[PDB]
Amino acid sequence: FMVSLPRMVYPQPKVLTPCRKDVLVVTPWLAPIVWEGTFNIDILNEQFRLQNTTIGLTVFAIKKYVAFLKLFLETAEKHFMVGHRVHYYVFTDQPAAVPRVTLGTGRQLSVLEVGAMRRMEMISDFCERRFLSEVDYLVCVDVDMEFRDHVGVEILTPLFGTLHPSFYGSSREAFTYERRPQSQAYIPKDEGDFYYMGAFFGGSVQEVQRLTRACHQAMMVDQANGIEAVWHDESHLNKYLLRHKPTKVLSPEYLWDQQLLGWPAVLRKLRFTAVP
Ligand SMILES: O=c1ccn([C@@H]2O[C@H](COP(=O)(O)OP(=O)(O)O)[C@@H](O)[C@H]2O)c(=O)[nH]1
Numbered sequence: 026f027m028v029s030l031p032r033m034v035y036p037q038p039k040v041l042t043p044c045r046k047d048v049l050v051v052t053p054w055l056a057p058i059v060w061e062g063t064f065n066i067d068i069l070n071e072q073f074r075l076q077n078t079t080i081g082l083t084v085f086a087i088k089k090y091v092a093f094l095k096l097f098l099e100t101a102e103k104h105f106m107v108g109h110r111v112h113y114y115v116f117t118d119q120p121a122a123v124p125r126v127t128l129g130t131g132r133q134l135s136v137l138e139v140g141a142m143r144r145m146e147m148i149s150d151f152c153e154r155r156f157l158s159e160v161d162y163l164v165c166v167d168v169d170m171e172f173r174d175h176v177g178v179e180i181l182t183p184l185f186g187t188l189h190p191s192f193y194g195s196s197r198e199a200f201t202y203e204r205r206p207q208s209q210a211y212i213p214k215d216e217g218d219f220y221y222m223g224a225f226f227g228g229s230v231q232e233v234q235r236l237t238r239a240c241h242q243a244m245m246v247d248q249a250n251g252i253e254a255v256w257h258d259e260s261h262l263n264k265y266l267l268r269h270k271p272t273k274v275l276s277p278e279y280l281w282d283q284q285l286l287g288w289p290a291v292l293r294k295l296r297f298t299a300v301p
């Protein structure tokens with residue numbers, strides 16, 4: 026059950042003035058594409074706080090990648106879901122190298138030791154029961170990243186993918202999908218909506234487990250068939266999101282590399298970015 030929103034004073038949405046005219050803000054299957062200017066964060070924060078939403082964030086930090094954790098967590102504290110309950114799940118081969126990062130109230134961190142792309146398996150079968158019990162949504166990201174601006178409840182939905190920053194302007198034939206019919210991740214040149222980046226996807230616990238289960242199974246089939254998809258987990262993610270349309274798509278504001286790609290006019294904010 027969802028209670029009434031309180032009285033709120035904000036600018037009237039205007040039907041005969043689009044928010045953004047420069048970009049596609051809804052997919053052909055009617056999923057919002059999330060850009061700055063498309064959402065009133067006060068309205069969304071109210072909706073999700075009234076549901077006492079808890080967001081789990083998974084991150085893998087194996088071998089040398091433990092070095093990225095301090096900046097990743099410190100900036101997540103500044104920018105990720107502030108005001109909401111957050112549970113970070115850090116998967117690592119070096120529990121003692123996880124930095125002591127100070128967390129705001131309502132936020133917690135769990136270190137999960139793993140053996141010394143396997144992310145799909147670890148998210149899916151091993152952590153299944155726990156996630157269902159502890160969080161409402163799961164967000165799965167790369168660790169070699171930092172938050173630079175707001176990343177909030179505007180992203181939450183049963184299933185989301187993020188536009189890869191190198192391909193958002195590209196034709197589908199240019200997308201680096203797996204192109205060999207022998208792979209489970211195969212997508213032909215006349216198919217594809219977008220090229221989604223493996224570094225930022227998520228949704229409800231149920232939908233994320235479905236996705237990671239499906240991708241883990243497809244990867245296993247490929248392995249048994251002696252084939253490895255061109256872009257590994259990302260290739261399989263793209264195949265999944267082709268056949269199971271996401272209910273929101275995040276713009277490249279949500280996964281950017283300023284060193285590689287600069288700061289184009291179309292991006293009003295750079296929210297979550299590669300660390301060189
Ligand atoms: O030795 C490694 C390699 C990869 N990773 C994890 O898996 C992601 C692997 O992708 P990587 O960032 O190296 O390449 P990219 O996705 O940027 O092309 C990293 O963010 C880490 O979270 C890791 O922890 N240790």
Ligand SMILES: [Mn+2]
Pocket residue numbers: 167168169224
């Ligand atoms: Mn990365």
